[PDB]
Assembly symmetry: C4
Homo-oligomer: 325 residues x 4
């Protein structure tokens, strides 16, 4: 079928996936108020484009935690990618390598840390981690990330328990509800790799993450799958950027579907954004080629949005490009 935007990929996915699998990937928590708002919030922020700036040579490149990327649009962690396509996380990492962007590998992946590193030897790769009740397993994963050339740890901190959208009983054995800032101190001592706190929604927590020596904040409501009725990530992003006072790089996920979403998040001070569901829809369409397609659509929507806004590169995207109304 002819797919020209990310929503077309989702609609294609709904048509080919078994209902249960599509619903698993689509769903948010409880009444799905935050799921709707992660998208609606982007539409409330309006763009104020500059004219006549010279955008002949647009350059989308940036850096994430000191590593160069082709665009400020990266693949976020999504569990069990082999349910969407046989090649799962291997298809995803190959697409990231082709695009020159980074892949955040899920802790619940249907491919090993080593298998993904060997599929995408030249790809920028990070590991998403939970601090499991079994701290030996946690340490083993960190050491394997270090050995297999992963460049950062994203520690997910918003899942002491799973959100309500016996598989959950199996995950309950793994996920530690007792995790505190003391366990973040332990993780910080365990590795010299950059660590990003994923799932922060409050400025005071972002300040605590900086105080604990972490290297970034991913402003995330876990794709609206954890606590329902939290705000949209794009709405909390300004408070978090303000709170960290430039000490660490702030990222965003939740609701990114269009190039204008990327532009609004960078205008409000995010270094880069991550996409979850759109990658899964790419896999459902055509594995590696479908992920490549989704990433290329986001890249060229972002390039156009930058050019129409008068931005020849990401360094000139400033706060006056957006206002909420």
């Amino acid at each position: 079928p002819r797919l020209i935007c990310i929503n077309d990929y989702e609609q294609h996915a709904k048509s080919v996936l078994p209902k249960s699998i599509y619903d698993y990937y689509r769903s948010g928590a409880n009444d799905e108020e935050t799921l709707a708002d992660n998208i609606a919030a982007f539409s409330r922020w309006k763009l104020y484009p500059r004219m006549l700036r010279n955008v002949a040579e647009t350059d989308l490149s940036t850096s994430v935690l000191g590593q160069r990327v082709s665009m400020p649009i990266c693949v976020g962690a999504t569990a069990m990618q082999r349910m969407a396509h046989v090649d799962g996380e291997l298809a995803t990492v190959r697409a990231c390598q082709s695009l020159g962007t980074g892949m955040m590998l899920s802790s619940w992946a249907t491919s090993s840390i080593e298998e993904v590193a060997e599929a995408g030897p030249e790809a920028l790769r990070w590991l998403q981690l939970y601090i499991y009740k079994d701290r030996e397993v946690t340490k083993k994963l960190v050491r394997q990330a270090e050995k297999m050339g992963y460049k950062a740890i994203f520690v997910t901190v918003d899942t002491p328990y799973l959100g309500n959208r016996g598989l959950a009983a199996y995950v309950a054995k793994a996920i530690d509800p007792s995790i505190s800032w003391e366990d973040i101190k332990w993780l910080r001592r365990l590795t010299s790799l950059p660590i990003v706190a994923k799932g922060i929604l409050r400025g005071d927590d972002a300040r605590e993450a900086v105080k604990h020596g972490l290297n970034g904040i991913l402003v995330s409501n876990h794709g609206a799958r954890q606590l329902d009725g939290v705000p949209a990530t794009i709405d909390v992003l300004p408070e978090i950027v303000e709170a960290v006072e430039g000490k660490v790089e702030v990222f965003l996920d939740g609701g990114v579907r269009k190039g204008t979403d990327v532009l609004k998040a960078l205008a409000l001070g995010a270094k880069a954004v991550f996409v979850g569901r759109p990658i899964v829809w790419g896999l459902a369409f055509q594995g590696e080629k479908g992920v490549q397609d989704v990433l290329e659509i986001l890249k060229e929507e972002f390039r156009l949005a930058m050019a129409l806004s008068g931005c020849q590169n990401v360094k000139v995207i400033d706060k006056t490009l957006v206002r909420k109304n």
Copy 2:
């Protein structure tokens, strides 16, 4: 059928009850503007969860008017529970006893004060009262509550006349439209039991209730069945908490359907919330077991919402967890 949230219980009830009985329980007054808003208002208050707090051991227990309860979620007065299930108020009190929460018995109950006390000897039980034109009947009910081990009187003060949603002619003979603060003075002198004013929507009235020696305020619009176009209870709650300056415990009812609703009401300073309609839907499903199910669903939704918000107990639920937008 498979019912996992309170809305599923309502939909089941609509399917099994005669239309007239379902509509009687569902309805609000006039155009039902307040009925819609009691629910919509909860969705406008957004949650700002703290991460990494240690929520392994969540404790939902609290106290209502000095009596310990298992959770800050209690059964509100709803007339004529035997229309939903043969066991009516006896089923409800048995479920409350099982849960360790309190039951507010309606003045228009299809079970006697004594019958309910003997069904739930160990249950925490309160009596909801009107000051009837017949003050002898009113005094007899208070004395029977005292003798049968009820722990408080909830005096409903928002029904001088019934709201417009010859049965009403029968109730018109009972309900006194002349009640004033002088009649509250009389009730306060009549009993040493704690008295809660149920149906206050204004700070100045809440202050008057404190001045009259009452022991609590239940912020209530009578489930949107009295005056239509009053605000949602969750929207007036902050003014009332502010007005009473900590002198008495403030409760809320109206629109509570989810654990996140409970969390938002406690964040804004309510000690506990009451549920009306959800209990009737529980009865319609399966009597005592259906009421137990609804109360358990609200308990575990509330536990999850607390844990995801970083609250290990009700004492740490604070105003920074919510903001209206």
Copy 3:
């Protein structure tokens, strides 16, 4: 059929009237934005009821321009009432006489000033006037109102031309687009009867009407049939009440369908409200008896709204009963 609220009367009218006649009465101007808002605006103003005030003996009576009425709910001018019912304006005046309220007779009535005075000799009656290009006709109507015991002139000032919802060519010959404050000076000199300016939407115009010796302002957008995109009357009412500084009585029409609408308008400082369309729906249902029914439904909805709000009479309806949100 069983009709319990004003909307039921409209739905009955749609069912019995020819489509063209129903649409003529229903319609507003252009895209009907103001028609929708005259109703929606009432729902945004929320009521803050006082409890425990003693409302056993509710008294709805008030006065309009020094004449006592049974309720602050009066019949507004609506052209060509004989299209709805054979008895037209005679049915309406008989119903007003039964209710003890006033009737504003249209300048475009299907009954003469004398015929209406003889149908309702004891009814409170006012004449709605245009200053026609033919000033002799205008003066003749005023003199006939004086002689036939009408108690005030309502001069409609918002129709220099008809709004866009060869009949209009006939009315174009009559209606003078040149009318200015100089013509108001002329009308003020012509009669000692109270004169009300009908169709004011701005405080500065209300102040000018006071300066010209007029005796009241009817805040009106002509039932949303003139300029579309003006505000709802309930939203402009506070500015107009503020502007006239108590010098003259301020009335409202536009969108009044319920007793709570009446209560909100009096809380914001209107002395009384007028109803247009609801009267026409009453006529379409059953002539005089249908108008009586509509007026009785508005009376008893208003009584209930007053009693539930803690108001035993109109003199205690105050601004703290309403807030916009």
Copy 4:
């Protein structure tokens, strides 16, 4: 068919045009958020009409860049008008000549600059220009406008690339993404004709256009066909009027469908407005006569809106006629 407002013309056009052509003319960019808002924004601005002003002799005439026009409603540039009607731009210019208003000829017209000048020798005519990569072509068009009696250049500055709603590859060869304020300096030196910057959405850019010696600003989001998620033109207009401090005439396009839209734009300080799509719907209906019809409907809607607002001419339309709510 019977067409009484601009929306009726669009609905007629949808019925007669091939779907692809209707969709080409209708569409906006991406999710069409700005397309919806260009219309919705007009409805949020409310009118505050003055009564009793004397509007017998309404005069709609004004001037655009020193040239008298019959009304402050002018034809904006729309490419390839021959797809709607065989007579295309020749039909449009003949209608403008009949009305006494101006036509802005598209750079992508299906009629030559000379052909349009000879169809409408007496019509007020302007040329819309791009600064093409081929600056010789650009200069040739300007010289031909000068020679063929066009009175101004509208330089479109919001299209460095086409918005996303191999034809685009053909236009990509022409449209220069490198254009800067240096190229505006060049154009200003090239011609003594008035130059208007079309597509400005920011006050700082409007100030820069004034500094560069341009003679007007057309506040435009290119009919919501360029960057999606910019604000509605009526919402940015006040900032732009404020920013230029009366130095140049400010115009508006985007979403004008009704006479009240024209009145709101002039109240907020626009000298005149331009219409795009409505003209194309006129052509689709009946060529020159259909364009004349649309312009006459906008003229007489505007006259009525002015008269009902108490404005006898455009010079008395002031900012107190509008407020946003």
